[PDB]
RNA sequence: AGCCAGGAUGUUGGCUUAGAAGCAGCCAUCAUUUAAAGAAAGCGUAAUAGCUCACUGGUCGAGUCGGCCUGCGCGGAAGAU
């Protein structure tokens, strides 16, 4: 679910995840999920959260999704001795660091909104928090 | 015996499956 | 004397007074004698043209005395009747169906004056308009 | 209509700034006009209360300090990355 | 009664009553709502 | 917070059930005398009924209430001499 259509390379380094997010501001919407936590979001995670949040406001309103995966995350097969090559691509994920906005919402009642994000938050591996756009 | 080698085992499971493909459709 | 000892309200049509699917358990029964009610209501059937609901007090004492005490007929069924739908709102109230004169449901609303319990005549007639959106239709305004 | 407490800063740089932010204060420079910029150590809770109204971002508003009645408009707000707290705010004169 | 890892309310009837060092939940209405360990 | 009463009329709101009636599923929330009262709160009746809610009347007299940033706490918590 939701991976880049084309890629500059088949594989990529583990890297690190030090730092704080830029996307601390609700933009496309008016209501949002700021991250607070730090970690990985697998594509199936953001998807399950999206479903759980979609069946909430139903068809009315709108949901922007800020994060996108592109970080391949490979693994070795079930029981192979170490190091005869780096493993094949397994599942894409989107790394996150605190302050990150996750989901954004269109014209929906704020209480229904807290219902929606209260639903969607449970699927996420990381902790979250509700936020509002601010005029400036 | 188990031994821990990878290809030494999947041959056996391959036989075990290859028979079931016949025995099912019969 | 609106304090009935054992009421079971049930609006009735002009068409019959003693069958079973309309009158009976639907209006309940306990000392009730519908067998005479066929001789009772149908004069009120004869008062005006048939095929309409006629709301009616089910006056019921434990003293064996009981009477129909007719209410003047509801505006909503009358509006489905005039609009001519043979079902209901069906489609959402966003799509209006009925089409009636504006003086109507005010010369038609006035018909219900015996059961209209507001004070101001126009607030009352507007209560009949609430009965109008009750159908999911709205008379031209 | 808004009115604001103030005192001149002397300490500056990341260390002193943290020593303020931990202490329920935050930095906020004030400039505008031809004259030199002047940083101010605002209290936190006060401003955090007052700013919550939207008009605070647009209303002309004073900042009391040494009786000079600085009278300024908001220009920028550094909100904390994930807490209901503030960091730093720009106050351009008007 | 389900013990459950996280009790919370169900019925508005529910009261949330701590006893000893441990949480319990009671409702005058439905019996099913009893809970412990929260 | 408690204690004494009402808590609504047109109207079963149209419909959908052979019978939706506030309460088996929609459309919708529209207009009403009135302290005010949802064409709709749970319980319940096959459907109706019946019984407790928001509002309010007195009684009682003064603190009560929902969230926010916070230090330390409990549950989560099962292993082999």
């Amino acid at each position: 679910m939701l991976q880049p259509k084309r890629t500059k390379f088949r594989k990529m380094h583990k890297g690190r995840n030090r730092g704080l997010a830029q996307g601390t501001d609700v933009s496309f919407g008016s209501f949002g999920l700021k991250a607070v936590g730090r970690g990985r979001l697998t594509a199936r995670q953001i998807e399950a959260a999206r479903r759980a949040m979609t069946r909430a406001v139903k068809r009315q309103g709108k949901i922007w999704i800020r994060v996108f995966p592109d970080k391949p995350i490979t693994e070795k097969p079930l029981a192979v001795r170490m190091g005869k090559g780096k493993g094949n691509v397994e599942y894409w994920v989107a790394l996150i660091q605190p302050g990150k906005v996750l989901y954004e919402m269109d014209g929906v009642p704020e209480e229904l909104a807290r219902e929606a994000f209260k639903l969607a938050a449970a699927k996420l591996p990381i902790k979250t928090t509700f936020v509002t756009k601010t005029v400036m | 015996c188990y031994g821990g080698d990878i290809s030494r085992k999947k041959k056996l499971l391959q036989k075990q499956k290859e028979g079931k493909k016949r025995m099912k459709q019969i | 004397a609106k304090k009935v000892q054992a009421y079971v309200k049930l609006q009735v049509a002009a068409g019959m007074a003693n069958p079973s699917p309309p009158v009976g358990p639907a209006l309940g029964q306990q000392g009730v004698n519908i067998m005479e009610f066929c001789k009772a209501f149908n004069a009120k059937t004869d008062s005006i043209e048939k095929g309409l609901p006629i709301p009616v007090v089910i006056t019921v004492y434990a003293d064996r005395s009981f009477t129909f005490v007719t209410k003047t007929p509801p505006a909503a069924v009358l509006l489905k009747k005039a609009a001519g739908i043979k079902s209901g709102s069906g489609k959402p109230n966003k799509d209006k169906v009925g089409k009636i004169s504006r003086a109507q449901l005010q010369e038609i609303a006035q018909t219900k004056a015996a059961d209209m319990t507001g004070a101001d005549i126009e607030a009352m007639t507007r209560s009949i308009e609430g009965t109008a959106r009750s159908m999911g239709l709205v008379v031209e305004d | 209509m808004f009115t604001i407490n103030a005192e001149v800063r002397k300490e500056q740089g990341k260390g002193a700034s943290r020593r303020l932010r931990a202490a329920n204060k935050f930095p906020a420079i004030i400039y505008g006009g031809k004259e030199a910029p002047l940083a101010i150590e605002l209290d936190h809770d006060k401003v955090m209360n007052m700013q919550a109204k939207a008009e605070f971002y647009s209303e002309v508003l004073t900042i009391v300090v040494d009786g000079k009645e600085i009278k300024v408009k908001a220009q920028d707000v550094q909100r904390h990355p994930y807490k209901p707290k503030l960091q730093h705010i720009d106050f351009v004169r008007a | 009664m389900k013990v459950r890892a996280s009790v919370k309310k169900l019925c508005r009837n529910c009261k949330i009553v701590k006893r000893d060092g441990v949480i319990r939940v009671i409702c005058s209405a439905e019996p099913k709502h009893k809970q412990r360990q929260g």
Side-chain angles (χ1 to χ4, degrees):
Chain A
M1 292 301 297
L2 181 62
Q3 66 182 22
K5 299 182 72 66
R6 294 173 59 188
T7 55
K8 181 172 71 182
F9 299 104
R10 182 174 64 250
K11 297 174 183 175
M12 185 172 283
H13 295 299
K14 182 185 295 179
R16 294 290 184 268
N17 198 31
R18 300 176 63 246
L20 296 177
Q22 298 300 103
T24 60
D25 296 342
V26 175
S27 65
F28 295 158
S30 299
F31 297 156
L33 286 173
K34 185 175 292 180
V36 173
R38 188 188 297 272
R40 295 185 180 178
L41 271 64
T42 68
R44 295 180 179 274
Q45 289 169 336
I46 73 102
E47 182 65 14
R50 183 199 66 81
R51 291 180 180 175
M53 175 176 66
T54 298
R55 175 58 181 84
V57 297
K58 291 180 176 179
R59 188 179 294 271
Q60 69 177 21
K62 187 179 177 63
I63 293 172
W64 295 272
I65 292 172
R66 303 299 296 273
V67 296
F68 188 84
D70 60 12
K71 183 178 171 63
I73 304 302
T74 62
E75 286 187 348
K76 297 292 282 185
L78 179 62
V80 57
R81 294 182 182 275
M82 290 299 183
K84 291 185 182 298
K86 187 182 175 64
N88 57 31
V89 181
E90 196 70 11
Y91 59 87
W92 299 88
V93 306
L95 266 63
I96 57 98
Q97 53 278 2
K100 182 63 173 170
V101 171
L102 280 70
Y103 299 93
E104 296 183 355
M105 184 176 284
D106 193 4
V108 175
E110 191 281 338
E111 190 67 14
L112 172 60
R114 290 185 182 276
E115 176 68 16
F117 296 157
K118 183 184 67 63
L119 294 173
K123 304 294 187 292
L124 298 174
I126 64 170
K127 187 174 295 298
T128 59
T129 188
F130 182 84
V131 294
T132 302
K133 182 178 180 180
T134 301
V135 176
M136 177 178 70
Chain B
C1 297
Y2 58 90
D5 191 4
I6 298 169
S7 66
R8 188 174 186 173
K9 187 183 293 178
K10 290 184 180 299
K11 182 184 77 178
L12 295 172
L13 184 65
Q14 178 64 59
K15 306 295 180 65
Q16 181 65 62
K17 292 181 295 186
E18 184 277 335
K20 297 299 180 67
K21 288 289 184 64
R22 292 202 299 269
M23 295 173 71
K24 176 62 173 173
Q25 292 180 337
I26 291 171
Chain C
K2 58 186 184 71
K3 185 61 175 170
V4 178
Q5 193 174 2
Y7 73 96
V8 177
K9 62 175 66 181
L10 176 63
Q11 301 86 2
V12 293
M16 288 181 71
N18 192 341
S20 179
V23 295
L27 56 81
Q29 188 167 355
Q30 50 183 15
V32 180
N33 193 340
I34 304 297
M35 177 182 71
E36 179 64 16
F37 181 82
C38 62
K39 291 293 184 65
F41 175 77
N42 283 339
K44 300 299 286 185
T45 296
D46 295 344
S47 180
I48 52 175
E49 187 275 338
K50 291 186 296 296
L52 280 67
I54 292 172
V56 58
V57 177
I58 305 299
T59 298
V60 174
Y61 300 145
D63 287 342
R64 182 53 57 89
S65 292
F66 65 86
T67 61
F68 70 89
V69 178
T70 183
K71 294 177 180 178
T72 188
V77 179
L78 296 174
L79 290 178
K80 182 191 292 179
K81 184 184 68 65
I85 301 104
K86 293 176 181 176
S87 63
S89 300
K91 271 67 181 180
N93 189 31
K94 181 70 178 297
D95 284 345
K96 273 65 181 176
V97 178
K99 54 181 66 181
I100 302 297
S101 179
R102 66 186 183 279
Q104 289 175 332
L105 290 174
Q106 186 167 354
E107 291 176 349
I108 290 176
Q110 186 172 354
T111 58
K112 290 186 67 65
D115 292 344
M116 293 169 70
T117 59
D120 186 3
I121 297 169
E122 188 177 0
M124 291 165 71
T125 300
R126 283 193 294 271
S127 64
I128 302 302
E129 289 182 350
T131 304
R133 177 181 282 178
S134 295
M135 177 64 183
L137 59 77
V138 171
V139 64
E140 291 82 355
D141 183 67
Chain D
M1 66 172 282
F2 293 155
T3 302
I4 295 169
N5 289 282
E7 291 180 351
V8 295
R9 298 182 65 191
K10 291 184 172 73
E11 296 174 350
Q12 64 178 18
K14 181 178 76 180
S17 296
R18 293 183 182 277
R19 283 191 293 277
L20 269 65
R21 291 184 180 86
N24 283 279
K25 268 74 176 182
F26 65 91
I29 191 168
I30 297 169
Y31 52 84
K34 61 188 181 69
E35 60 183 340
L38 177 63
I40 303 300
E41 59 181 346
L42 299 177
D43 186 3
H44 178 58
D45 290 344
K46 305 292 184 64
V47 177
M48 184 65 180
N49 291 340
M50 295 178 72
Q51 67 172 18
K53 292 177 179 177
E55 300 87 358
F56 178 82
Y57 296 141
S58 65
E59 293 176 348
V60 175
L61 51 86
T62 60
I63 295 173
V64 176
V65 55
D66 291 342
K68 290 179 177 177
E69 294 177 350
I70 312 303
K71 183 175 292 296
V72 295
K73 295 180 71 67
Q75 182 64 61
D76 184 5
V77 172
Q78 286 183 334
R79 299 180 179 279
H80 191 69
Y82 61 93
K83 297 174 73 69
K85 293 183 70 66
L86 292 175
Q87 295 292 99
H88 185 277
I89 290 172
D90 294 344
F91 289 105
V92 177
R93 291 178 185 171
Chain E
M1 61 170 283
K2 291 187 174 75
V3 288
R4 172 162 288 109
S6 63
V7 287
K8 65 174 64 181
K9 290 182 179 299
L10 296 177
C11 51
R12 68 182 179 275
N13 303 130
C14 302
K15 185 181 172 63
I16 310 299
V17 178
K18 185 174 180 178
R19 299 181 187 177
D20 291 345
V22 63
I23 297 169
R24 298 180 186 274
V25 176
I26 303 299
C27 295
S28 64
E30 184 66 14
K32 289 181 176 179
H33 302 169
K34 288 173 60 182
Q35 293 177 336
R36 184 182 67 249
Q37 176 179 349

